[PDB]
């Protein structure tokens, strides 16, 4: 049948060939209309047609992510990272940066943390 694992092992050429067979086979299930049946292959072909499109989209993201790790990029990867405006608002990020420098240093000093420490 089709399993997700088989599609991944297949090539970019090979899955495209699958999508082509899948449309033909779905098309024949159109013709076989006069009955009822014919579908336990279309519901599952609908799932197959979705799996093959997903798996390619995923392959292209990963490949893109490798090519771009080297360079500079990222409006698209940016959208996944935040997961919008609020979680974005919670950033810049603000936290280490805020106390990155004044007056803390004086305040204190630690031989003291160690000395006590057991």
């Amino acid at each position: 049948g089709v399993k997700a694992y088989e599609l991944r092992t297949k090539s970019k050429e090979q899955l495209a060939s699958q999508l082509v067979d899948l449309k033909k086979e779905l098309a024949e299930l159109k013709v076989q209309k006069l009955s009822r049946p014919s579908l336990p292959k279309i519901k599952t072909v609908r799932k197959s047609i979705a799996c093959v499109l997903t798996v390619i989209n995923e392959q292209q993201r990963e490949a893109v992510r490798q090519l771009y790790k080297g360079k500079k990029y990222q409006p698209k990867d940016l959208r996944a990272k935040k997961t919008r405006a609020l979680r974005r608002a919670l950033t810049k990020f603000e936290a280490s940066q805020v106390t990155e420098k004044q007056r803390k240093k004086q305040i204190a000093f630690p031989q003291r943390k160690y000395a006590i420490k057991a």
Partner: protein, 122 residues
């Protein structure tokens, strides 16, 4: 000190009576997005009815079920590629189904009857 003649002379050469220039535009850099290829299957099923068959015999005319973001150009291209027939006129109809009836008129170079036989419709 007293003031300049692209500024003085030009003004002697108008009374407005517009400017004129134009000024530039690249793409900058941080990259945008969209690659897509998203694709509708225009032809959805052949319609199958008693009236459809007579239109096959009588005037050489297929009856397809089409998308509601179909047009007539889309259908003409779609039949041409997948069925190698050249299509001469395309009729597009709303249905109370919520779907599209297309009566698609074909060339006598390949009669409608045996085009139809391999993706059957009655």
């Amino acid at each position: 000190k007293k003031a300049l003649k692209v500024r003085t002379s030009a003004t002697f050469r108008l009374p407005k009576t517009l400017k004129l220039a134009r000024a530039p535009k690249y793409a900058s850099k941080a990259v945008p997005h969209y690659n897509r290829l998203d694709s509708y299957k225009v032809i959805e099923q052949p319609i199958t009815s008693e009236t459809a068959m007579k239109k096959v015999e009588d005037g050489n005319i297929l009856v397809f079920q089409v998308s509601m973001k179909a047009n007539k150009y889309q259908i003409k291209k779609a039949v041409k590629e997948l069925y190698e027939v050249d299509v001469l006129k395309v009729n597009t109809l709303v249905r109370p189904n919520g779907t599209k009836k297309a009566y698609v008129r074909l060339t006598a170079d390949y009669d409608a009857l045996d085009i139809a036989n391999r993706i059957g419709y009655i």
